[PDB]
Structures are given as structure tokens and as C-alpha cells.
Amino acid sequence: DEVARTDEWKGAGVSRLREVWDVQHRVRLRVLWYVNSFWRSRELSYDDHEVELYRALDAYRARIAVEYVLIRAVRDEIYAVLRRDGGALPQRFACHVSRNMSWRVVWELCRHALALWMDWADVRSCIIKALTPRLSRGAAAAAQRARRQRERSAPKPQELLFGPRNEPAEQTWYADVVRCVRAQVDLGVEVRAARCPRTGLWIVRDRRGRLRRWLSQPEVCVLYVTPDLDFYWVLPGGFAVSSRVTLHGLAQRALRDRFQNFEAVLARGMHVEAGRQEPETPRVSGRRLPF
Amino acid sequence: SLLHTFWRLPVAVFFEPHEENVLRCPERVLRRLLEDAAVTMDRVRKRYLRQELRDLGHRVQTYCEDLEG
């Protein structure tokens, strides 16, 4: 009568149990070493040469460094475009101004604000949450759809008389808010954006619908980034450094595996039909019975 | 320093909160803020590297001293 593997696996037990760490020393978790694993019987060999670990460290350095050098690319993009225009930035955002007010101090506050933003960048920032939906498949599909959509010819009166009708209302931007008097920056700002009917300037609002009012505060500064990866940098008064974010100096696969929006597999609790109303999550309870 | 405004003659405002508020902080607040901005403003690693070179330069002397045992 052959002993089933669960019995002598149960009576085998564990040799040893120890903790390990991540690279950045943020996570401690414990490994388990059963004596009855076939890894014990596989007698596999092991070696750790120093240039191999050095290559591992350089690869990990690049994998960390991707978003930080993207931030540096954004910063010297700002520097190049302020050197480009000569330093006289125009207004893109709808808010009134006062002539009898010294703009030298808000210019100095803008310099200090971009400095403090460079000190306090993050892997979770405005531009990362901006370009994370760009990595999706539907981003490419809707890019093709918009490139055929806006670049569509003027219609003849025949489809005006008999053809079916045609339909881009407001934008979903992200923002960094750097507050110099309290030395606190902001990384994740979700903001709705629109255009005024009377003038082409922008109007920003809360995702609930509340008007965003920080532009009146002179000590603060803001950075806006769009879903099509444009770039604004607004000091108070609505005047905006305007450019695009450069990423050609970064590899495709490093940005693609370092962070990417995730498409889900089907598990318990979700519909087989796509886009149906989701029921309640499984939510295993430490408060109720397991049942 | 001072901006070049497109509209020559200036215009009053009803001061709606639904209108974006207009830069109401006067120049003494900007003086206070420039004071706040003014007041709020390696080689030792390679030193320790070459000092570890000195420690191993002592350690090869300890290596030479320990071979007679």
C-alpha cells in the first residue's frame, strides 16, 4: 500500500524558516523550506559571479532610473523652452490679472517652485498617471479613431440629407501642485479641463465639479499634463510654459514593463460579459465566519 | 517685469466665486512671501574607499605576519 505524498509530506515538515528583504529594504517576508520538496532532490548547482551581479545592479539601476530621467527630461524641456522664447511666456489659462502688482516676486516663486518640484519628484507623479492610460490597447485603437476622426473631410449635402449623423467635450488632466510657503508639493492631482466659450483659454475644475481655485494664490505653482501628453506649467496669473514631454531618450521595453496599466483576467465575482455592472468583491473576512 | 496686456483699458469684476479669483494679495503679502522664500532656502565616499585601501594595505601586512604559524 503506497504512502500518498500528503502523509509523508505532512510528517516531513520544515527544515528552516527565515525572512528576506526586497532591494530597497521596504518589505520583509518569510520563506518556507520543506524538506520534502523535489528541489531538495534536484541537486541543482549554483554560482554567483561578480560581473553578473554587477550587470544585475546596473539593470536594476536603469529600471529604477526610467521615471526619474523622464522627470529630468521634462525639466530641461522647460529650461530649453524658456531659453527658446527668450523668457516671455504667454497666457493660456482664464484668470484676470492686475497691472499694479510686482511680477518679479512671483517669478522668483516660480523658480523656487520648480526647484522644489525637482527635489520632490516621484514615481507616482502627474505625468506617470497621465501616460499610464496611454499604454493600453484601447489607447492605440482610439488614437487611430481620432486620427481618422478629426482628419475627416467636409461632408457633402447628400449625407447631410440622408446619411446618419455625427457626434470630445472636456479633458481629463493630471497635475502637480507645488506649494512653496509650506514646502509641500503634490503628485497626484486629477483635474477636469475645458475651454471658455468667450475665449480660448483653459478652465480647470475638480473631478466632482468644483472650480479649482489655487491659481489665485500667488505662492503656489502648478504643472498640468494631458492625456495626449502635452505639457503646461502655470505660475499664478494663468501664464503657462507650454511644450510636449519628450520620451525618445527612453527605451520602449523598460517603460513598458516598469509600469503599465493592467488588463484583468476573469476570477470569482466578475461578469463573463464585458462592461456589465460588477457585484460585490469576494472580501474574505477577519470579522465574520469563513463559511 | 510688468506684463504686456492685450486689452488696453482695464475692466471691473463682479467677483463671483464661480469666476476664478483675481490675485487679491497686495504687495506687503508679497514682501512677506519673498522673505519666506529667502529664509527657506560625495568626496567622503571616495575618501572612505581609499581608506579601505589603507585598511587592506595593513591587512596584507597582517597576511605576511600570519604565515609563520
Binding site: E50, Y54 | L49, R59, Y63
Partner: peptide, 20 residues
């Protein structure tokens, strides 16, 4: 007999040299 200990110690130090 103390050549092996100081020798693997110096190779450990050279492994440290690939870390800084």
C-alpha cells in the same frame, strides 16, 4: 596556512570593490 583565509578575505574585498 593563513594564506587561504587572508586570500579569500582579499578576494572578498575585491568583491566589495565591485560594489562601490
Amino acid at each position: 596556512l593563513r594564506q587561504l583565509a587572508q586570500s579569500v578575505q582579499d578576494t572578498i574585498q575585491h568583491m566589495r570593490f565591485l560594489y562601490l
